[PDB]
Amino acid sequence: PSPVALITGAGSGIGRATALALAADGVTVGALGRTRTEVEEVADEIVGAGGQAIALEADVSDELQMRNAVRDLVLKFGHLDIVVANAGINGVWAPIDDLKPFEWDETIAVNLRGTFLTLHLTVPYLKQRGGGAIVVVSSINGTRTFTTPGATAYTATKAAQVAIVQQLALELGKHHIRVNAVCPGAIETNISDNTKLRHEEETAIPVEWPKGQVPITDGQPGRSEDVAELIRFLVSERARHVTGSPVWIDGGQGLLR
Amino acid sequence: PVALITGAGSGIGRATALALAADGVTVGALGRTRTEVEEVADEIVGAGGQAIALEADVSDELQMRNAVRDLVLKFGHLDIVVANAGINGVWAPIDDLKPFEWDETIAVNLRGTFLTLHLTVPYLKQRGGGAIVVVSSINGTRTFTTPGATAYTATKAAQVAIVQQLALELGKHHIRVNAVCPGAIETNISDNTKLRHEEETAIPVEWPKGQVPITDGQPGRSEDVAELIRFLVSERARHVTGSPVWIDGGQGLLR
Amino acid sequence: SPVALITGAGSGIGRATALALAADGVTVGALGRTRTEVEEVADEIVGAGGQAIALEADVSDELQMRNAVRDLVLKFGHLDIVVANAGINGVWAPIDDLKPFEWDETIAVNLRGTFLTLHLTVPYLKQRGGGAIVVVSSINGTRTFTTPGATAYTATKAAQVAIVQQLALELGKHHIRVNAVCPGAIETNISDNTKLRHEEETAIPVEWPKGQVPITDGQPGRSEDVAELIRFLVSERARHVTGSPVWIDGGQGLLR
Amino acid sequence: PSPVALITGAGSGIGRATALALAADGVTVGALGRTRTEVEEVADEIVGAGGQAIALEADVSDELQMRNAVRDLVLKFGHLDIVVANAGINGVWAPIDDLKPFEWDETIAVNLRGTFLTLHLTVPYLKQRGGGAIVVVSSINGTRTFTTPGATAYTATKAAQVAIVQQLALELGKHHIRVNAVCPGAIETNISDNTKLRHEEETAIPVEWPKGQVPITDGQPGRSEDVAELIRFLVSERARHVTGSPVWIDGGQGLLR
Structure with missing residues (x-):
């Protein structure tokens, strides 16, 4: 009775690492993304390691593509x-x-x-x-x-x-x-890293963190597989009493910024 | 002193327009329906202060700019x-x-x-x-x-x-x-004439003493909320910013 | 006309709070760690029109509080x-x-x-x-x-x-x-506290080149400020407000 | 290596479940509680199921016992x-x-x-x-x-x-x-089960839940093994980037009450 997951924005970052994570638990994965080729590549890799996967190309804000x-x-x-x-x-x-x-x-x-x-x-x-x-x-x-x-x-x-x-x-x-x-x-x-960011000087409250602002990793961002790991736990039967909770995964940066 | 109040035709919006006008604040009562806000503007000019009624759908760029x-x-x-x-x-x-x-x-x-x-x-x-x-x-x-x-x-x-x-x-x-x-x-x-299948979504619950502790039972008054806004847009509140404030008579904790 | 107990009333937010509440025909019991101060505020409340009493007591002590x-x-x-x-x-x-x-x-x-x-x-x-x-x-x-x-x-x-x-x-x-x-x-x-040690061990270093109280260009809030909000929260202007927190921080807090 | 855990309240409920869950991943356990005998049988159970445990008797409000x-x-x-x-x-x-x-x-x-x-x-x-x-x-x-x-x-x-x-x-x-x-x-x-509860009628807002007040389980309270599972996840390396976070395990109930 092997489990089925739709994962959106699967073509990369957390979505991609999530898709691998769950595939490794033998969850069969529908990897939906905005770019065929990226989502094809992860479905391929999943099938390459003997998993089950369909790449699904769709724009998430479009009703018809999504139903399809x-x-x-x-x-x-x-x-x-x-x-x-x-x-x-x-x-x-x-x-x-x-x-x-x-x-x-x-x-x-x-x-x-x-x-x-x-x-x-x-x-x-x-x-x-x-x-x-x-x-x-x-x-x-x-x-x-x-x-x-x-x-x-x-x-x-x-x-x-x-x-x-x-x-x-x-x-x-x-x-x-x-x-x-x-x-x-x-x-x-x-x-802060966005190429469509305009006029930082007007909006940012200026601040310097001589020792980074991500305490658990010493200033460094967390990694996709970190989020992946958490989602993997929360979708498993290990989390069967957990519903309607958020769970912060920021290495402490939330408490800082 | 000039205030724009949206949704000003009734309810909290109407009540806030009145309360603020009463503090000598020129009110721009804005709303979906012209006569509603005309009436609230009129009562304000009629009662002493200065106002103007503004008819706009709040989701509409153009009406809002105008x-x-x-x-x-x-x-x-x-x-x-x-x-x-x-x-x-x-x-x-x-x-x-x-x-x-x-x-x-x-x-x-x-x-x-x-x-x-x-x-x-x-x-x-x-x-x-x-x-x-x-x-x-x-x-x-x-x-x-x-x-x-x-x-x-x-x-x-x-x-x-x-x-x-x-x-x-x-x-x-x-x-x-x-x-x-x-x-x-x-x-x-939960009174909304557009609610469908309430059966299927509400988690069934009964409140024998009601669920608004401070008014034991009934909802709050528009004029209550008006008072809060009045305080919060006043100089009395000069240091308060970025704060939420719950005016729920405790109902928020129950529900 | 109604009566209020204010603890910590010898100074800071307390004092300011006793004053503002007086200025509203509210009779105050100013309760503090050290009498000289609370009778000082109570004195200033009376003869400036209002009713007030000073009370000496430590909040953590059952008997004195009961007293x-x-x-x-x-x-x-x-x-x-x-x-x-x-x-x-x-x-x-x-x-x-x-x-x-x-x-x-x-x-x-x-x-x-x-x-x-x-x-x-x-x-x-x-x-x-x-x-x-x-x-x-x-x-x-x-x-x-x-x-x-x-x-x-x-x-x-x-x-x-x-x-x-x-x-x-x-x-x-x-x-x-x-x-x-x-x-x-x-x-x-x-972070101003004379009983604070090992600040550098404990503090995450941060520089705020333009302050960290937005509404004040970085100056701490004023006692009267907090008092004013307290004054709002005890009046019948707030009959429907209960069980709520209200942050009075000029945005710091969203920041710290 | 083999990590060492201290679990307080390991006498029963969540603590005992946790000790066992932790021991099952090969963690060495100091099971600590007020009553020696309760933590003796959780230690003794882990030992001779392969584990390593010891029973620690202490009142958690007492500096000297805790320190020892x-x-x-x-x-x-x-x-x-x-x-x-x-x-x-x-x-x-x-x-x-x-x-x-x-x-x-x-x-x-x-x-x-x-x-x-x-x-x-x-x-x-x-x-x-x-x-x-x-x-x-x-x-x-x-x-x-x-x-x-x-x-x-x-x-x-x-x-x-x-x-x-x-x-x-x-x-x-x-x-x-x-x-x-x-x-x-x-x-x-x-x-609400507390024998030292007192004048409950004077303090409760009266309330009735015809379909119960814990959604995911049709009104039943969760198991200790549930909480242990979360704890197990949170203390492991699958959670390297999670710190500073609450997590609610209430099957929906916290949102109700």
Whole structure:
């Protein structure tokens, strides 16, 4: 009765490392991403080590592509058990009056609508399967951290996410669906690191950390496999009493920023 | 002293317009429906103070720009923003909530919050400071049981995040940004004519002594929330910024 | 016209709070560690129009608290308003190096103090048929965790908020509102404490080239500021507010 | 090598489950409790199932006993790597004005002073050893739930515990010590079973849950083995980047109460 997971934003970072992690537990993985070739490459690697995997190309904020990806995946394997809502962008960070409506919309569409679409379309199958496990990947931003220069839209979306998670934990417990949130700090790259960041000087409260600001690793970002490991635990039956909890994975950086 | 208050046709918005006008604050009552805000403006001019009624859908760039331009062109400046406009939208099980229903709750409560702040911050900067309050809820902040209320929960939780980013971003411009978080006001907690399948989503519970401890039973008054906003946009609160405040008579802890 | 007990009233937030509450036709019992100070505020309250009494007592001591609350009901007949506001910073040190008595002392004053202050005043407030309580906490333990070696303090400030919320629900039917106040730096810098050791061992080094109190370009908040909020929270202007924390930090806290 | 753990409250419930869960990954265990015999059978069970354990009798509010127990464990196995501060008592729940100062003192001494003592004594050994992992078992009370009838004193100490965990995550990051808080809901017994509960009708907001108040389990409280599992995850290397975090294990309940 081998378990099935949809993992979004699987083409890289945490999503990718998550996909490997779970494949290694013999979870068969639907790896959905915005770029065919990246998601093909991870599905390949998974099959290369004798796993099961479909690459699914889709834009997470698009209703039709998503329905088509979900239907596709259930058809190939028969059931759905595990969902990781990981797709997100940072989008534009800029002064509240410089951030344009259309660029606000875009961060809301991928990060926020994508979460709604992802769940709406998968919850039916989970309900039918008799239960499963959901994790949505949020952030320290909007939960513990409010300093990332002009990141309001992102922040808004990331706070929304943990709220969705707790609402649904309750809605879905009677259906034996566990819903958790995972909140990373900087993974792989600096917290501030966005090429669509504009006008840092206006938004940043200036600050120097002579000894880094990620205490457990001595200033260094956490790594994709770290988040992977956590999601792997939370989607397993080892976490069978855990629902509607966030879990911060920031090496202490949340408490700092 | 000039205030823009959105969702000002009724409820908290109407009550805040009145309370603030009573402190001598020129009010720009803004709302979905013209006659509602005309009436609130009229009562204010009628009772002594200065006002103007502004008809805009809060999710709409264009109306909002006009609405803001017009308020600034009639009174000179901006000092206070109460971002209050919003909707419950449809509450339904996550699988029954439609994409377009989801989009509409986000459009009004979230995008409308963005736009409201997006357009008023330059004026508050020019004036050299001011006070913002965004009206959230116990939903998304303490309370996660309101049935199928996901989209709404989302927006309310988002707002508090916005408030804290903006408190830090704007502190140096002397703009204070706070979040007010009422429990049930006027109407009770789960009264929404667009609720579907409440059966399937509420976790069944009974409250023999009620679940608003301080008013043992009934919801709070719009004028209550108005009082809080009044305090929070006043000089009495000069050092308060980036704080949420729960006005739920304890209901937030129960639910 | 109603009566309020203010602990820690000899100075700081306490004093400011006694003053502002007077300036509202509120009769104050100023309770402090050291009489010279509290009779000094009480004197200033009287003859400047208002009713007031000074009370000497240590919050962590059962008998004195029982004593002094008795003494304040006798003189004015009732209690309407308690403001629990007495604390020490106490010793801040590495958890490694902080000592049991030092730890113990910060629990006595801040935690046991607050339990006692409410233990012996709730009953009169119920009898009055309702009133208002506010407990003065801190960004420490609520939003802030970098104050070097302040664990003990942080423990008690965090417990205060928990207490507020528990009793807010327990005392709702008695029409007693219960709220928290959580100041950032007031009058003084946030790591300013003469009983702090091994700062460099404990503190994560950080430089704030432009301050870390946004609304003030980096100057600590003022006692009157906090007082004003307390004054709001005890008035009937806030009839519906109970079981809530309110942060008064000028944004620091989102920052520390 | 083989790491050494100190688990306090290892007599029964979560502590005993934890000791066994830890021992199963080959961790050496100092099982510590108030009553010698309870921790004798958890030690003796691990030993002769292959493990290494020793029983440590101590009152967690007493400096000298705690110091000696901690010291014994280091003398026996040479180092300390893991610490699960779990000892705690419900104490007396009563109206605020009914609750006697001495019985207030009792709850603080055991719950709070016992946490300080547990950490103060163990931390030097973790430093010395060059790293390690700590978890304090707090509760949904004081963090999410505030309705447990007149449980003020208890609630107060649990909320302090999670605040300490965060200070200490920051203070000990550079020393490579992770410190997280686990907050279970009801486990083994209902949320409200306390023989020293007193005037519960005067303190409860009356409430009825026709379908129960713990979603993921159709109203039943979680198992000790559940909490142990979380603790096991959090003290291992699968959690290298997690520190400073609460985690709720309440099957939804904390969101209800």
